Design a protein around this ligand. Structure first.
Ligand code: ZN
Ligand code: ZN
Length: 48
């Protein structure tokens, strides 16, 4: 089967917990840690 997963564009691990997906960049995601460290902070993100 094809497993769908979201990998953080900062630590390159999978996103567990909150997912911070950029609203501007296509297909860019950060985990809660990388988000806290201020990566990609110049773009609005979707925190679901
Ligand atoms: Zn991360
Ligand atoms: Zn972006």
């Amino acid at each position: 089967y094809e497993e769908e997963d979201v990998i953080c564009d900062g630590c390159n691990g999978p996103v567990v917990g909150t997912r911070y997906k950029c609203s501007v960049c296509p297909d860019y995601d950060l985990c809660s840690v990388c988000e806290g460290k201020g990566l990609h902070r110049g773009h609005t993100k979707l925190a679901f």
